[PDB]
Write a protein that binds this ligand. Sequence first.
Ligand code: HEM
Ligand code: HEM
Ligand SMILES: CC(C)SCCC(=N)NCCC[C@H](N)C(=O)O
Ligand SMILES: CC(C)SCCC(=N)NCCC[C@H](N)C(=O)O
Ligand SMILES: C[C@H](O)[C@H](O)[C@H]1CNc2nc(N)[nH]c(=O)c2N1
Ligand SMILES: C[C@H](O)[C@H](O)[C@H]1CNc2nc(N)[nH]c(=O)c2N1
Ligand SMILES: [Zn+2]
Lengths: 407, 411
Amino acid sequence: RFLKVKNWETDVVLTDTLHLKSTLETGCTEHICMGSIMLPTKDQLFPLAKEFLDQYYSSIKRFGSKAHMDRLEEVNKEIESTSTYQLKDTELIYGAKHAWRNASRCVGRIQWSKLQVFDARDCTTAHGMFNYICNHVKYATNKGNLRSAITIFPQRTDGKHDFRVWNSQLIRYAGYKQPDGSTLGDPANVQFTEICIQQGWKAPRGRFDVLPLLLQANGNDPELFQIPPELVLEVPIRHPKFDWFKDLGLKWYGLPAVSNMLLEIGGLEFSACPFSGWYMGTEIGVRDYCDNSRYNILEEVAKKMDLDMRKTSSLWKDQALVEINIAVLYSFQSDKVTIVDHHSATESFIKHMENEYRCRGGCPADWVWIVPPMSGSITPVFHQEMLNYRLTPSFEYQPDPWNTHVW
Amino acid sequence: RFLKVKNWETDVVLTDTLHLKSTLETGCTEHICMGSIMLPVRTKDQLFPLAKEFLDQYYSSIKRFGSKAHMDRLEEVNKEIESTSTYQLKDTELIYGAKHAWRNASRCVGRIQWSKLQVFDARDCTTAHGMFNYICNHVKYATNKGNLRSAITIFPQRTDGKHDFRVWNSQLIRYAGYKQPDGSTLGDPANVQFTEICIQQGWKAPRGRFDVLPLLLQANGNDPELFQIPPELVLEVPIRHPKFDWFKDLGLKWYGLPAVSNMLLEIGGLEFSACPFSGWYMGTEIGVRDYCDNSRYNILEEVAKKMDLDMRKTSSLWKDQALVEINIAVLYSFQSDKVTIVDHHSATESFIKHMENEYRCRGGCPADWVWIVPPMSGSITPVFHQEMLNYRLTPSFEYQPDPWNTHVWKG
Ligand code: HEM
Ligand code: HEM
Ligand SMILES: CC(C)SCCC(=N)NCCC[C@H](N)C(=O)O
Ligand SMILES: CC(C)SCCC(=N)NCCC[C@H](N)C(=O)O
Ligand SMILES: C[C@H](O)[C@H](O)[C@H]1CNc2nc(N)[nH]c(=O)c2N1
Ligand SMILES: C[C@H](O)[C@H](O)[C@H]1CNc2nc(N)[nH]c(=O)c2N1
Ligand SMILES: [Zn+2]
């Protein structure tokens, strides 16, 4: 029932009780651990609503008050009558912040209570969606002083009138298959790029082309819009010691904005809920630049550094990796665009875990995602035991719309 | 039922059926995953089923399932259990069992090598001096003057739990740690408590930064006895860097033979509480963990000082820079002295090939991602991108409590 987690570097032990409140399932069983797998009615809704309102009223220290009991009755009445219900602004803000608080894969949660929530439930068209999104982008970017934000579109109804952003992130680069057999741009986005073309986008067919938005309102066919270029803050990548680095022609965008997830609050489903914070440097320099299935630039960089690439044991990949990551952080810092390094980010997360343990009784965390993709054991999270479990409100994965949409 | 795992770099999808043979539990439930938790006498009643599954497995491995020889062995084991409360493994079954415990070790990246294990049968051992002799022979054989060979030595199994064979050392070869009155540590901080025990047992400590610890050996539930491994049997490597000439003056060395001595081997219900085993190092074990953990030798600052990196801000990645240089040094030093070592790129690439071959031939390969992914440069190794299923197969290696916590002192 009560569970201990130990830090093997500091010997600090913490007791988790919060997991007992957990509801959804992990994918694991007593016989098999699925810890490293990427993706493991009216009757249904009222318990979900109650569970949520109970935690909301508890949080404002008004549990079992007249105002508490009155809202539960009102929501039950609305469900019985409409088969759904509407959240108060206060409940929406609370729910969104707590979905982030509960995000077991997010290292940046120390920030969870400073989220600017943009209520877009009055939106009816793709043009309106585009307007809301440009405003989100400009607010969050803040000329490089980035601010966390989420924009929340109308909830699911009968399931044939879904709002969706087809893009995986608001800002991403195009990918094109070449007659060469190679890939131009970002190979992760080839399929989405093709969907854009088949829908009518004229592509510049370059290495770093900001994709258009493909927005779906009210279960209608999705529509294309180019984000005003002046709202997309980008960063040229240079190195503080290697003058040749700029010749590689690398750039990245300042605003990481996940747009393909589903926000669940009190049983209600927000299928369009783009949200954004700011980058941890490794996301760009380790993953986006060095994954073999991504920009895969390790080979080119190592060559310019004149390292011995004859044998893996020279650690040439490891040397180049570090340099690429130094350059990303240096470039963002020099252009005054918010970025956090993996040492600072994991250090703050340890402090956050301890806050959550004493103030809340625990913190769900997925070690496989929390530990940075480079220099794992020299960050304090490596040595920290974590318990992973699913609390609601939550951000969830959902299938890509092109597999699902009825045209 | 079939379970699928995907590699997100290659899109290669594999199907696991082997998990259906898993009996032991994980620590996880449908409501909690304990995937990152480090540590999450039998009755005749429980013993014969365990013996039976094992012998059915052994007899299938040799293509003799249901044979007269298989059936006669079952009956023989059965009768021996009801008569004596336990049983003895044939040499062939012992070898198969020890190899399979390695094959089944989900935290081990080196498993491509599982079928090449030299098994030394030490079940006729009776005394601590006997144990010492067996362990010296293991060390000499495994070391092989730098050309390391995997080996395990197997002492007599548990009987009533009052007559246990134990090696009190956590590894056969490790360096002493000494806590000083000013709170600093001399040597390896991981071994402070064990060093304190050795000293109290009468070990005369040299008190340097790399003093090889004595063996503390318990035979037959008796109080443990101290022994010094002959220095000439302990192969060591001075650490230097290919381009940095000041690196040698750090005064660093490490031993060549990594030999875990504190685990328990379970085969067919039988418990071998002293079963030291050894392979060879992956460089990051020494360069990342042993040298750079804050709770170990903690050399990152001193190395980064000497390199003249910008140390005032973590975002210069000074720690990451120093980390790579140290790890280059460890591999360079071992290679130069012709002592077996494997880099983390080579080892992970070989593990993926092993894992795929195991899916094809065995129907699965239990693997613990948290342990398999190296402690530096995670995502530039292929294992990071590989989904894995963790489950527990027998024969297996298991943790057991440290013996100073459980031993009944005789005096
Ligand atoms: C403010 C600074 C933030 C930092 C430094 C940060 C850090 C990170 C990192 C490094 C990841 C792993 C991403 C990957 O590997 O693809 C992540 C994932 C995630 N973050 Fe955060 N984050 C921040 C803000 C936010 C916000 C504002 C939200 C929601 C309101 C959020 C929710 C999530 C979720 C749900 C995931 C998992 C996404 C997935 O499974 O792909 N984060 N975060
Ligand atoms: C042949 C070369 C081998 C290599 C390169 C290798 C590599 C490794 C590494 C890097 C680890 C993680 C160690 C740590 O972080 O402390 C490990 C763990 C382990 N290995 Fe291997 N290994 C080898 C041979 C063996 C052998 C011969 C056995 C037994 C017969 C074995 C069984 C295990 C077990 C049980 C663990 C988990 C240890 C624990 O939980 O503390 N390995 N191996
Ligand atoms: C938006 C939430 C998921 S986390 C806040 C932003 C962020 N730090 N990253 C988002 C993921 C970006 C991706 N890894 C990339 O490298 O492009
Ligand atoms: C003996 C099995 C567990 S694996 C075969 C040897 C090995 N490669 N490592 C053993 C652990 C060494 C420890 N990490 C150290 O850094 O001293
Ligand atoms: C197979 C494995 O689960 C997968 O590669 C994971 C590992 N850890 C990760 N960690 C983060 N933060 N982001 C990721 O995309 C991944 N990928
Ligand atoms: C808490 C966490 O599980 C612990 O630090 C683990 C992480 N992964 C590891 N992986 C290996 N190979 N060896 C280790 O000691 C550890 N330590
Ligand atoms: Zn699990």
